[PDB]
Structures are given as structure tokens and as C-alpha cells.
């Protein structure tokens, strides 16, 4: 329960760093070049392949 | 882009749905008032028909 | 990129909200015509 | 909802602290917030009542042991006028043999 609550609280606190576009949203950050395939595989599970 | 297309699609579909919901509810409101007007003319002319009946019967008796 | 998403989201909310209020003004015209026909039929 | 989940996490941390266990990470428990709160609150309430009863009983045992034999000796000495309405008995756990 502490693990699931820490994950949900992390998602909630990370939602505060977002940017809203009046029923629109985006996220920006940094990621290493060696994780571009892992980031693409994570983005493969997107709703419309965002 | 594609994201502009899908967000414009969803917002346009929901303002379309708002149009449909609001105008259907407003027409369902107005129809009862119009039928009230027609049936009120019916009952009004029925009461005035009773008045015409009273006038003919009293002219008969006189 | 980031600033491209900034510009795109600004244009997104601008054009979608402007279409929204244009459609609600045409809804206002529909309401006006409907009560005009209502009062013409009642009179 | 974020405040509710944060309060659930803080209550789980306080329950683990009162349980004596440490914050060890593991696999999460995927469920709703209400059922997880209902599961957490039962164990937290049982542990809180047990810890409060244990702390109160330990304090009571320590306070009883601090003046156990002397209260018995003073009551055995004052077993004739304990609550008689003519004489108050000031008892004092005082120092060594300087009774004058």
C-alpha cells in the first residue's frame, strides 16, 4: 500500500509540473540518447502514438 | 497537425452535441405551451358554446 | 520542439474557442427565430 | 484526491513507524483509493489502540512501582484514620533519619 501510494502521489505531484492548453496538454524534459528506444517503446503504448 | 485535427474534432463534436441537447430540450418545452394554447382555445370555445346554448334556450322561453 | 508546442497549443485553443463561440452565437440566432415563430403562431 | 492519497501515504508511514517496521519498497497494490483506505484504517486503528493501551499500561506499571511498598507501609501505619472526618494525614516520602 505504501508503494502504490508513493507511486500515485508521485504521479499527482508530477501532474503539477505539466502545462495546460485549455483542454490540451504537453510535457517536456530531458532523456539520454541511449534510452531513445526505451522511450519509443514507452510511447508505443500511447493512445494515438503521440 | 493530427493532434490539432483530433482536438478540433472533439471540441466541434461536443459543441454540436450541446446544440442538439439544448434545442431538443427547448423544443420539448415549447411544444407543451403550444398544445396548451390549442386545448385552451378548445375549452374556451366549449364554454362559449355553452353560453350560446343558454342564449338560445332563454330566447326560446321568452 | 518545446516552443513549437507552445505556439501550436496557443493556436489550438484560439481557433477551437473561436469556433465554439461562433457556434453559440448561431445558437442565439436560433433561439431568437424560435421565439419569434412562437409569438407569431400565438398571435 | 491528491491530498487524500498523500494522507493515505502519511498514515501508512505512521502505521509502519508505530509497527516498528521500516519503509522497505516492494510491488504495489493495485486497487481503488477507498478500498485501500478501508484496509489501511483497520490495521492502523488496531495498532493505534494497542500502542496507546501498551504505553498507558507501561506508564501505569512504572508509576505503581515507583511508590508500591511505601504506600502500603503508610496505609498500614494509618489504618485507623484513613478518611475519618477529623484528621488529615500528610504523608511524605522524605529523606533519611533527620526526623527532628
Swiss-Prot record, chain B:
Cellular component terms per the entry's GO annotation: proton-transporting two-sector ATPase complex, catalytic domain
MF terms in GO: ATP binding; proton-transporting ATP synthase activity, rotational mechanism; proton-transporting ATPase activity, rotational mechanism
Keyword field: ATP synthesis, Hydrogen ion transport, Ion transport, Transport
Top-level taxon: Bacteria
Keyword Transmembrane helix tagged: no
Gene Ontology biological-process annotations: proton motive force-driven plasma membrane ATP synthesis
Family: Belongs to the V-ATPase E subunit family.
Protein purpose: Produces ATP from ADP in the presence of a proton gradient across the membrane.
The protein's name in its UniProt record: V-type ATP synthase subunit E
Source organism per UniProt: Thermus thermophilus (strain ATCC 27634 / DSM 579 / HB8)
Amino acid at each position: 500500500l505504501w508503494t502504490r501510494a508513493q507511486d500515485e502521489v508521485a504521479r499527482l505531484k508530477a501532474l503539477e509540473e505539466l502545462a495546460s492548453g485549455r483542454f490540451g496538454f504537453a510535457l517536456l524534459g530531458y532523456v539520454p540518447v541511449k534510452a531513445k528506444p526505451k522511450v519509443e517503446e514507452a510511447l508505443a503504448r500511447h493512445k494515438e502514438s503521440v | 497537425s493530427k493532434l490539432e485535427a483530433i482536438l478540433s474534432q472533439e471540441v466541434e463534436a461536443e459543441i454540436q452535441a450541446l446544440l442538439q441537447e439544448a434545442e431538443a430540450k427547448a423544443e420539448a418545452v415549447k411544444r407543451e405551451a403550444e398544445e396548451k394554447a390549442k386545448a385552451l382555445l378548445q375549452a374556451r370555445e366549449r364554454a362559449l358554446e355553452a353560453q350560446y346554448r343558454a342564449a338560445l334556450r332563454r330566447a326560446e322561453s321568452a | 520542439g518545446g516552443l513549437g508546442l507552445i505556439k501550436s497549443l496557443a493556436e489550438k485553443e484560439k481557433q477551437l474557442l473561436e469556433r465554439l463561440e461562433a457556434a453559440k452565437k448561431e445558437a442565439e440566432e436560433r433561439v431568437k427565430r424560435a421565439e419569434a415563430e412562437a409569438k407569431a403562431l400565438l398571435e | 484526491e491528491l491530498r487524500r492519497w498523500e494522507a493515505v501515504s502519511a498514515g501508512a508511514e505512521h502505521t509502519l513507524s508505530l509497527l516498528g517496521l521500516e519503509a522497505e519498497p516492494a510491488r504495489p497494490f493495485p486497487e481503488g483509493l477507498e478500498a485501500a483506505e478501508k484496509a489501511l484504517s483497520p490495521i492502523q486503528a488496531h495498532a493505534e489502540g494497542l500502542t496507546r493501551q501498551k504505553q498507558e499500561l507501561e506508564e501505569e506499571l512504572a508509576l505503581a512501582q515507583a511508590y508500591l511498598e511505601p504506600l502500603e507501609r503508610l496505609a498500614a501505619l494509618a489504618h485507623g484514620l484513613d478518611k475519618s472526618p477529623f484528621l488529615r494525614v500528610i504523608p511524605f516520602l522524605l529523606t533519611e533519619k533527620e526526623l527532628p
